[PDB]
Amino acid sequence: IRPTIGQQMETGDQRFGDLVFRQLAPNVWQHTSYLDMPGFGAVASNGLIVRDGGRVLVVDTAWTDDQTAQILNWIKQEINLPVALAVVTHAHQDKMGGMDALHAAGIATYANALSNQLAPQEGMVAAQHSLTFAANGWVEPATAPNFGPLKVFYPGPGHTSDNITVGIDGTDIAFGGCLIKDSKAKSLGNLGDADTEHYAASARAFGAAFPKASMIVMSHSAPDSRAAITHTARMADKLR
Ligand SMILES: CC1(C)S[C@H]([C@H](NC(=O)Cc2ccccc2)C(=O)O)N[C@H]1C(=O)O
Ligand SMILES: [K+]
Ligand SMILES: [Zn+2]
Ligand SMILES: [Zn+2]
């Protein structure tokens, strides 16, 4: 319950099985799951759950199929609406480790085409459907049908070459996934698959795609202010 990496539990957190849920807005919750590293401890990872138009939309899986099934069970108990689709934000275990559980539940899955192409090489199951992007970063609309309030944006290579981001129209929330680190972070996390030349511009592009959002949600820290974007970009400036 006390991760080595990731935010600790706080007031407003609901423990459900091995996961933690936090309501961020009337129709938006953050899911948190934990992977125990032998000799190191637990690493927390965050995604989103959105209620729109009688259905639920999921952003990112948990680390494993079992944890992702637990997300679906929490949805059933707390929201009790069908889960129409999930979007996963790049091909690494913290974001895509639970694809099989979504597929077995009948949930349609979407990822950047490049995420689907990298998925097997990264140990992940590909999503069923591929999103593609305009040169300006915005999703090609016919590849993202019935996405409700989700606004999917590819900011450019950064944490990985395939990383995508998601804003929730009608809210104060935008989700940077593993691209954005919090405003007090000391590092950019795992740079092993990263594009250090383009990272800073990609972080700034995320901020400019979602100019209004004041709640920046991210994979390994509690939601932060827009200072997370500026700090991430300035940390990334030093990589060039
Ligand atoms: C430092 C991280 C939190 S590690 C994570 C990701 N690694 C995995 O999902 C695999 C994995 C499997 C078992 C244990 C740990 C990791 C990656 O390589 O980007 N995201 C990084 C980040 O956001 O900076
Ligand atoms: K890799
Ligand atoms: Zn990653
Ligand atoms: Zn991560």
PDB file of all heavy atoms in Angstrom, residues 5 35 37 43 63 90 92-94 159 178 181 188-190 220, ligand 1:
ATOM      1  N   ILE A   5       7.730   3.659  -5.874  1.00  0.00           N
ATOM      2  CA  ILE A   5       7.582   4.647  -6.939  1.00  0.00           C
ATOM      3  C   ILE A   5       6.094   4.877  -7.162  1.00  0.00           C
ATOM      4  O   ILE A   5       5.323   3.915  -7.248  1.00  0.00           O
ATOM      5  CB  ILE A   5       8.241   4.173  -8.250  1.00  0.00           C
ATOM      6  CG1 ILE A   5       9.762   4.164  -8.117  1.00  0.00           C
ATOM      7  CG2 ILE A   5       7.835   5.078  -9.418  1.00  0.00           C
ATOM      8  CD1 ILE A   5      10.322   5.427  -7.538  1.00  0.00           C
ATOM      9  N   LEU A  35       2.770  -2.841  -9.097  1.00  0.00           N
ATOM     10  CA  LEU A  35       3.566  -3.988  -9.484  1.00  0.00           C
ATOM     11  C   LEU A  35       4.725  -4.101  -8.511  1.00  0.00           C
ATOM     12  O   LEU A  35       5.477  -3.140  -8.325  1.00  0.00           O
ATOM     13  CB  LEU A  35       4.052  -3.848 -10.925  1.00  0.00           C
ATOM     14  CG  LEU A  35       4.993  -4.955 -11.351  1.00  0.00           C
ATOM     15  CD1 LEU A  35       4.165  -6.213 -11.474  1.00  0.00           C
ATOM     16  CD2 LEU A  35       5.482  -4.602 -12.704  1.00  0.00           C
ATOM     17  N   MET A  37       8.189  -5.106  -7.454  1.00  0.00           N
ATOM     18  CA  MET A  37       9.504  -5.435  -7.986  1.00  0.00           C
ATOM     19  C   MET A  37      10.300  -6.198  -6.935  1.00  0.00           C
ATOM     20  O   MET A  37      10.550  -5.655  -5.849  1.00  0.00           O
ATOM     21  CB  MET A  37      10.237  -4.156  -8.341  1.00  0.00           C
ATOM     22  CG  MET A  37      10.160  -3.739  -9.801  1.00  0.00           C
ATOM     23  SD  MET A  37      10.256  -1.941  -9.988  1.00  0.00           S
ATOM     24  CE  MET A  37      12.004  -1.632 -10.235  1.00  0.00           C
ATOM     25  N   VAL A  43       5.575  -0.444  -7.512  1.00  0.00           N
ATOM     26  CA  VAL A  43       5.496   0.689  -8.430  1.00  0.00           C
ATOM     27  C   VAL A  43       4.029   0.911  -8.776  1.00  0.00           C
ATOM     28  O   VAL A  43       3.356   0.004  -9.292  1.00  0.00           O
ATOM     29  CB  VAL A  43       6.332   0.452  -9.699  1.00  0.00           C
ATOM     30  CG1 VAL A  43       6.287   1.684 -10.612  1.00  0.00           C
ATOM     31  CG2 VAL A  43       7.779   0.100  -9.326  1.00  0.00           C
ATOM     32  N   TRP A  63      -1.261  -3.131 -14.598  1.00  0.00           N
ATOM     33  CA  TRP A  63      -0.037  -3.846 -14.974  1.00  0.00           C
ATOM     34  C   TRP A  63      -0.313  -5.260 -15.469  1.00  0.00           C
ATOM     35  O   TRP A  63       0.484  -5.805 -16.246  1.00  0.00           O
ATOM     36  CB  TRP A  63       0.900  -3.972 -13.785  1.00  0.00           C
ATOM     37  CG  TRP A  63       1.422  -2.723 -13.195  1.00  0.00           C
ATOM     38  CD1 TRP A  63       0.879  -2.019 -12.157  1.00  0.00           C
ATOM     39  CD2 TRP A  63       2.656  -2.074 -13.522  1.00  0.00           C
ATOM     40  NE1 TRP A  63       1.681  -0.953 -11.841  1.00  0.00           N
ATOM     41  CE2 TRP A  63       2.781  -0.962 -12.658  1.00  0.00           C
ATOM     42  CE3 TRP A  63       3.664  -2.326 -14.459  1.00  0.00           C
ATOM     43  CZ2 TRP A  63       3.871  -0.090 -12.708  1.00  0.00           C
ATOM     44  CZ3 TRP A  63       4.762  -1.460 -14.507  1.00  0.00           C
ATOM     45  CH2 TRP A  63       4.862  -0.366 -13.624  1.00  0.00           C
ATOM     46  N   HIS A  90       0.492   3.691 -24.599  1.00  0.00           N
ATOM     47  CA  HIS A  90       1.652   3.212 -25.358  1.00  0.00           C
ATOM     48  C   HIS A  90       1.933   1.773 -24.959  1.00  0.00           C
ATOM     49  O   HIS A  90       1.364   1.252 -23.993  1.00  0.00           O
ATOM     50  CB  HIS A  90       2.912   4.069 -25.245  1.00  0.00           C
ATOM     51  CG  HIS A  90       3.531   4.072 -23.889  1.00  0.00           C
ATOM     52  ND1 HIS A  90       3.052   4.844 -22.856  1.00  0.00           N
ATOM     53  CD2 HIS A  90       4.619   3.423 -23.403  1.00  0.00           C
ATOM     54  CE1 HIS A  90       3.806   4.671 -21.789  1.00  0.00           C
ATOM     55  NE2 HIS A  90       4.771   3.823 -22.096  1.00  0.00           N
ATOM     56  N   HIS A  92       3.815  -0.411 -23.276  1.00  0.00           N
ATOM     57  CA  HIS A  92       4.610  -0.850 -22.126  1.00  0.00           C
ATOM     58  C   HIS A  92       3.654  -1.453 -21.101  1.00  0.00           C
ATOM     59  O   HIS A  92       2.446  -1.204 -21.137  1.00  0.00           O
ATOM     60  CB  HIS A  92       5.383   0.312 -21.481  1.00  0.00           C
ATOM     61  CG  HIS A  92       6.680   0.628 -22.171  1.00  0.00           C
ATOM     62  ND1 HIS A  92       7.363   1.802 -21.956  1.00  0.00           N
ATOM     63  CD2 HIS A  92       7.442  -0.083 -23.037  1.00  0.00           C
ATOM     64  CE1 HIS A  92       8.468   1.823 -22.676  1.00  0.00           C
ATOM     65  NE2 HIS A  92       8.547   0.686 -23.337  1.00  0.00           N
ATOM     66  N   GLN A  93       4.205  -2.248 -20.180  1.00  0.00           N
ATOM     67  CA  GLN A  93       3.377  -3.074 -19.300  1.00  0.00           C
ATOM     68  C   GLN A  93       2.448  -2.247 -18.409  1.00  0.00           C
ATOM     69  O   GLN A  93       1.312  -2.669 -18.122  1.00  0.00           O
ATOM     70  CB  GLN A  93       4.258  -3.955 -18.418  1.00  0.00           C
ATOM     71  CG  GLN A  93       3.432  -4.988 -17.663  1.00  0.00           C
ATOM     72  CD  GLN A  93       4.216  -5.843 -16.731  1.00  0.00           C
ATOM     73  OE1 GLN A  93       5.432  -5.922 -16.803  1.00  0.00           O
ATOM     74  NE2 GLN A  93       3.505  -6.530 -15.861  1.00  0.00           N
ATOM     75  N   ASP A  94       2.924  -1.108 -17.891  1.00  0.00           N
ATOM     76  CA  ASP A  94       2.053  -0.324 -17.018  1.00  0.00           C
ATOM     77  C   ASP A  94       0.801   0.176 -17.728  1.00  0.00           C
ATOM     78  O   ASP A  94      -0.204   0.441 -17.060  1.00  0.00           O
ATOM     79  CB  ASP A  94       2.812   0.793 -16.258  1.00  0.00           C
ATOM     80  CG  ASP A  94       3.606   1.766 -17.157  1.00  0.00           C
ATOM     81  OD1 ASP A  94       3.821   1.526 -18.368  1.00  0.00           O
ATOM     82  OD2 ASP A  94       4.116   2.781 -16.593  1.00  0.00           O
ATOM     83  N   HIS A 159       8.607  10.039 -24.111  1.00  0.00           N
ATOM     84  CA  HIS A 159       8.857   8.857 -23.291  1.00  0.00           C
ATOM     85  C   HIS A 159       9.053   7.614 -24.160  1.00  0.00           C
ATOM     86  O   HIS A 159       9.944   6.796 -23.901  1.00  0.00           O
ATOM     87  CB  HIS A 159       7.692   8.692 -22.325  1.00  0.00           C
ATOM     88  CG  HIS A 159       7.688   7.389 -21.628  1.00  0.00           C
ATOM     89  ND1 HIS A 159       8.582   7.069 -20.629  1.00  0.00           N
ATOM     90  CD2 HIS A 159       6.962   6.275 -21.861  1.00  0.00           C
ATOM     91  CE1 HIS A 159       8.373   5.829 -20.237  1.00  0.00           C
ATOM     92  NE2 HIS A 159       7.393   5.333 -20.965  1.00  0.00           N
ATOM     93  N   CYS A 178       2.783   8.414 -19.280  1.00  0.00           N
ATOM     94  CA  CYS A 178       4.163   8.411 -18.801  1.00  0.00           C
ATOM     95  C   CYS A 178       5.000   9.536 -19.395  1.00  0.00           C
ATOM     96  O   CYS A 178       6.155   9.716 -18.990  1.00  0.00           O
ATOM     97  CB  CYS A 178       4.813   7.046 -19.042  1.00  0.00           C
ATOM     98  SG  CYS A 178       3.910   5.664 -18.300  1.00  0.00           S
ATOM     99  N   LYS A 181       5.798  14.114 -16.122  1.00  0.00           N
ATOM    100  CA  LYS A 181       6.155  13.851 -14.737  1.00  0.00           C
ATOM    101  C   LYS A 181       5.729  15.034 -13.880  1.00  0.00           C
ATOM    102  O   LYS A 181       5.448  16.117 -14.383  1.00  0.00           O
ATOM    103  CB  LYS A 181       7.666  13.618 -14.616  1.00  0.00           C
ATOM    104  CG  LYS A 181       8.049  12.144 -14.608  1.00  0.00           C
ATOM    105  CD  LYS A 181       7.636  11.406 -15.860  1.00  0.00           C
ATOM    106  CE  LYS A 181       7.820   9.883 -15.689  1.00  0.00           C
ATOM    107  NZ  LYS A 181       7.946   9.149 -16.981  1.00  0.00           N
ATOM    108  N   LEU A 188      13.033  12.116 -15.464  1.00  0.00           N
ATOM    109  CA  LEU A 188      12.004  11.789 -16.436  1.00  0.00           C
ATOM    110  C   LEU A 188      11.650  10.302 -16.451  1.00  0.00           C
ATOM    111  O   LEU A 188      10.967   9.851 -17.372  1.00  0.00           O
ATOM    112  CB  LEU A 188      12.414  12.282 -17.834  1.00  0.00           C
ATOM    113  CG  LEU A 188      12.387  13.810 -17.991  1.00  0.00           C
ATOM    114  CD1 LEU A 188      13.141  14.247 -19.247  1.00  0.00           C
ATOM    115  CD2 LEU A 188      10.967  14.342 -18.032  1.00  0.00           C
ATOM    116  N   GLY A 189      12.063   9.533 -15.439  1.00  0.00           N
ATOM    117  CA  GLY A 189      11.711   8.119 -15.389  1.00  0.00           C
ATOM    118  C   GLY A 189      12.571   7.284 -16.325  1.00  0.00           C
ATOM    119  O   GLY A 189      13.750   7.576 -16.548  1.00  0.00           O
ATOM    120  N   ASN A 190      11.970   6.223 -16.876  1.00  0.00           N
ATOM    121  CA  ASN A 190      12.720   5.301 -17.723  1.00  0.00           C
ATOM    122  C   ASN A 190      12.871   5.954 -19.087  1.00  0.00           C
ATOM    123  O   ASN A 190      11.885   6.148 -19.795  1.00  0.00           O
ATOM    124  CB  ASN A 190      12.044   3.929 -17.827  1.00  0.00           C
ATOM    125  CG  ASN A 190      12.968   2.871 -18.452  1.00  0.00           C
ATOM    126  OD1 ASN A 190      14.051   3.193 -18.932  1.00  0.00           O
ATOM    127  ND2 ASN A 190      12.537   1.611 -18.442  1.00  0.00           N
ATOM    128  N   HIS A 220       2.485   8.185 -12.813  1.00  0.00           N
ATOM    129  CA  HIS A 220       3.185   7.778 -11.594  1.00  0.00           C
ATOM    130  C   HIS A 220       3.214   8.846 -10.509  1.00  0.00           C
ATOM    131  O   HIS A 220       4.036   8.765  -9.596  1.00  0.00           O
ATOM    132  CB  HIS A 220       4.594   7.273 -11.892  1.00  0.00           C
ATOM    133  CG  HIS A 220       4.608   6.225 -12.946  1.00  0.00           C
ATOM    134  ND1 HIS A 220       4.064   4.971 -12.751  1.00  0.00           N
ATOM    135  CD2 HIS A 220       5.033   6.260 -14.224  1.00  0.00           C
ATOM    136  CE1 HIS A 220       4.169   4.271 -13.859  1.00  0.00           C
ATOM    137  NE2 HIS A 220       4.751   5.031 -14.765  1.00  0.00           N
TER     138      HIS A 220
HETATM  139  C1  LIG B   1      10.040   4.184 -14.585  1.00  0.00           C
HETATM  140  C2  LIG B   1       8.676   3.723 -15.084  1.00  0.00           C
HETATM  141  C3  LIG B   1       7.607   3.924 -14.003  1.00  0.00           C
HETATM  142  S1  LIG B   1       8.775   1.932 -15.528  1.00  0.00           S
HETATM  143  C4  LIG B   1       7.416   2.092 -16.747  1.00  0.00           C
HETATM  144  C5  LIG B   1       7.665   1.269 -18.066  1.00  0.00           C
HETATM  145  N1  LIG B   1       8.071  -0.080 -17.723  1.00  0.00           N
HETATM  146  C6  LIG B   1       7.195  -1.084 -17.634  1.00  0.00           C
HETATM  147  O1  LIG B   1       5.987  -0.911 -17.724  1.00  0.00           O
HETATM  148  C7  LIG B   1       7.798  -2.464 -17.454  1.00  0.00           C
HETATM  149  C8  LIG B   1       7.995  -2.863 -16.013  1.00  0.00           C
HETATM  150  C9  LIG B   1       7.717  -4.158 -15.597  1.00  0.00           C
HETATM  151  C10 LIG B   1       7.920  -4.534 -14.281  1.00  0.00           C
HETATM  152  C11 LIG B   1       8.387  -3.620 -13.360  1.00  0.00           C
HETATM  153  C12 LIG B   1       8.660  -2.330 -13.759  1.00  0.00           C
HETATM  154  C13 LIG B   1       8.468  -1.953 -15.077  1.00  0.00           C
HETATM  155  C14 LIG B   1       8.710   1.927 -18.978  1.00  0.00           C
HETATM  156  O2  LIG B   1       9.710   1.263 -19.301  1.00  0.00           O
HETATM  157  O3  LIG B   1       8.465   3.078 -19.367  1.00  0.00           O
HETATM  158  N2  LIG B   1       7.158   3.506 -16.941  1.00  0.00           N
HETATM  159  C15 LIG B   1       8.290   4.295 -16.459  1.00  0.00           C
HETATM  160  C16 LIG B   1       7.977   5.777 -16.506  1.00  0.00           C
HETATM  161  O4  LIG B   1       6.782   6.105 -16.650  1.00  0.00           O
HETATM  162  O5  LIG B   1       8.957   6.561 -16.488  1.00  0.00           O
END
